[PDB]
From a paper:
Natural resistance-associated macrophage proteins (Nramps) are APC-superfamily transition metal transporters that enable uptake of rare micronutrients such as Mn2+ in plants and bacteria and Fe2+ in animals. Nramps bind and/or transport biologically-essential divalent metals such as Mn2+, Fe2+, Co2+, Ni2+, Cu2+, Zn2+—and toxic metals like Cd2+, Pb2+, and Hg2+—but not the abundant alkaline earth metals Mg2+ and Ca2+. Metal uptake by Nramps is typically stimulated by acidic pH and accompanied by proton influx. Nramps have 11 or 12 TMs, the first ten forming a LeuT fold, as seen in structures of three bacterial Nramp homologs, including our model system [name] (Dra)Nramp.
Adding steric bulk along TM1a—for example a [name] mutation, which mimics a human anemia-causing mutation of a conserved glycine —prevented the opening of the extracellular vestibule and eliminated metal transport, emphasizing the importance of the alternating-access mechanism to DraNramp function. WT-like DraNramp (with the indicated reporter cysteine and a C382S mutation to remove the lone endogenous cysteine) maintains a dynamic conformational equilibrium—even in the absence of added metal substrate—such that either reporter can be fully modified by the thiol-specific N-ethylmaleimide (NEM) at high concentrations. [name] slightly increased A53C accessibility but fully protected A61C, indicating an outward-closed state that we will refer to as inward-locked based on these data and the structure described below. We have thus identified two complementary constructs that trap DraNramp in outward-locked (G223W) and inward-locked ([name]) states. Using lipidic cubic phase (LCP) to mimic the hydrophobic membrane environment, we crystallized and determined the structures of [name] and G223W to resolutions of 3.0 and 2.4 Å, respectively, both significantly improved from our earlier DraNramp structure (3.94 Å). Unexpectedly, the [name] structure is not in an inward-open conformation with our Fab-bound Patch mutant but instead adopts an inward-occluded, metal-free state that may represent an intermediate conformation between inward-open and outward-open states in the DraNramp transport cycle. The major exception is TM1a, which swings ~45° to partially seal the inward aqueous cavity in the [name] structure, a motion we previously showed to be essential to the transport cycle. The intracellular ends of TM4 and TM5 also move slightly compared to their position in the inward-open state, further sealing the metal-binding site from the cytosol. Comparisons of the [name] and G223W structures indicate that, rather than preventing inward motion of TM1a as we had hypothesized, the [name] mutation precludes TM4-TM5 from fully closing the inner gate, as any bulkier replacement for that absolutely-conserved glycine in our outward-open G223W structure would clash with E176 on TM5.
Residue numbers in the entry: 45 to 167, 174 to 436
The structure:
């Protein structure tokens, strides 16, 4: 189902880095960020899936077929940058997990991950790979209960509070890792077909089934993300630990549960998430290219081009977790440019048919878009001026 692929993409190294760094640096105070981002992601993924089901065309294809040529050029370029950032995050996460597993430097780890992507790109194994991530998520769900978190701080973390200079930055990172624009584009394509009869009855059936699937998947994965942040908080926040929040250290979150094999299991799960999410990211990037332009560059060429930012970042000596969080921030910045056409098209009868979005949900989505735009503007204000 498309919800499985969306949940695979929602469990990427970017999500891992954001959850762990948020926990370690700010305690439970971003649980409300995670919850709100998960709700917005539910709404937006539902809107994109409904767009796909009702119109038969995905969001990039509709943009290309309905909007002026220069606007389509701009949209293709921005979506390509979004895909570059997403694949950078996921590929560098896979490389960092290879490093944690074997001991190789980041360069040769990225080389091994490139060989693995070459081996995979020949082609059902990504859901099996994702099962590792699902199991480490269950491990986190148990570790939350076992770690005995401070329920007072946990409850206080659900009240919306941006406290500190980098709090807005990390909340933007969480929102970008949860509401992924490449997945906003890809979800419409995942439900484009499989419709034997174009009737409104079957379209409504698909809409409801996909709604249930995506809500279940996003709810489970948001429970997992909140659990990861809570364990990271209870593990590194109050205690003064060096390099707290780095994914190299994050294995200590599951030490009281797994024991000596905690680091190996965390490295394996992060590699699994990196590979699966990178496959999903290359799929979404090819869908973006096709929908926006009409033609396609070779898949191996796109893979080799998307490896270039990863290898450049490795050569620059930049920190992997830091650049992952930055990539998720860039994704959050890219979110509104994808939300606007989605809302406009889902509020149109000539596009949706009898499945036009309810005006209440359209207003909710516009409120979400305004919130995200204001948060991105506030982050830009803090990062550039006073
Ligand atoms: C200061 C302004 C903030 C004021 C507060 C505004 C909050 C609105 C934002 C997020 C909640 C929206 C998500 C809650 C609804 C979730 C419904 C859902 O998940 O399903 C959607 C449905 O399937 C569609 O087709
Ligand atoms: C046992 C496996 C089932 C897992 C069930 C899902 C766990 C909760 C999920 C999300 C909330 C995470 C936010 C933290 C909420 C408070 C943490 C908590 O529940 O603590 C338990 C209690 O303190 C102990 O005595
Ligand atoms: C952040 C600030 C704006 C993000 C909103 C992005 C707005 C994207 C351009 C506006 C638009 O989508 O207008 C298309 C119109 O339908 C063509 O006929
Ligand atoms: C607090 C700021 C207001 C936020 C949301 C209000 C609803 C936002 C409305 C967005 C305007 C763009 C639009 O959707 O225009 C449709 C128009 O009704 C076609 O006739």
């Amino acid at each position: 189902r498309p919800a499985v692929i969306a949940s695979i993409a929602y469990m990427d190294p970017g999500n891992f880095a954001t959850n762990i760094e948020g926990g370690a640096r700010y305690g439970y105070s971003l649980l409300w960020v995670i919850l709100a981002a998960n709700l917005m992601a539910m709404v937006i993924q539902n809107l994109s899936a409904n767009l796909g089901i009702a119109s038969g065309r995905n969001l990039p294809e509709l943009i290309r077929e309905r909007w002026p040529r220069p606007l389509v050029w701009f949209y293709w370029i921005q979506a390509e940058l979004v895909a570059m950032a997403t694949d950078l995050a996921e590929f560098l996460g896979a490389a960092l997990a290879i490093q944690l597993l074997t001991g190789l430097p980041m360069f040769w780890g990225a080389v091994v991950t490139g060989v693995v992507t070459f081996w995979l790109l020949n082609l059902p194994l990504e859901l099996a790979v994702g099962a590792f991530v699902l199991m480490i998520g269950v491990a986190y769900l148990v570790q939350v209960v076992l770690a005995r978190p401070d329920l007072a701080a946990v409850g206080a973390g659900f009240v919306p509070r941006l406290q500190g200079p980098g709090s807005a930055y990390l909340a933007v990172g969480i929102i970008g890792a949860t509401v992924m624009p490449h997945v906003i584009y890809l979800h419409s394509a995942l439900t484009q077909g499989r419709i034997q009869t174009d009737t409104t009855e079957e379209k409504r059936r698909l809409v409801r089934l996909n709604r249930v699937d995506v809500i279940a998947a996003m709810g489970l994965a948001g429970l997992i993300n909140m659990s990861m942040l809570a364990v990271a908080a209870a593990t590194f926040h109050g205690k003064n630990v060096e390099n707290a929040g780095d994914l190299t250290t994050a294995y200590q979150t599951l030490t009281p549960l797994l024991g000596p094999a905690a680091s190996v299991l965390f490295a394996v799960a992060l590699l699994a998430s990196g590979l699966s999410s990178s496959a999903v990211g290359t799929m979404a990037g090819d869908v973006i290219m096709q929908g926006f332009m009409g033609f396609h560059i070779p898949l191996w060429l796109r893979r080799l081009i998307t490896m270039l930012p990863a290898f450049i970042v490795i050569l620059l000596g930049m920190d992997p977790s830091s650049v992952l969080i930055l990539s998720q921030v860039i994704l959050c910045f890219g979110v509104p440019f994808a939300l606007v056409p989605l809302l406009l098209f889902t509020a149109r009868r000539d596009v949706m048919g009898a499945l036009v979005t309810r005006r209440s949900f359209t207003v909710i989505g516009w409120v979400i878009a305004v919130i995200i735009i204001a948060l991105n503007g506030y982050l830009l204000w803090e990062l550039l001026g006073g």
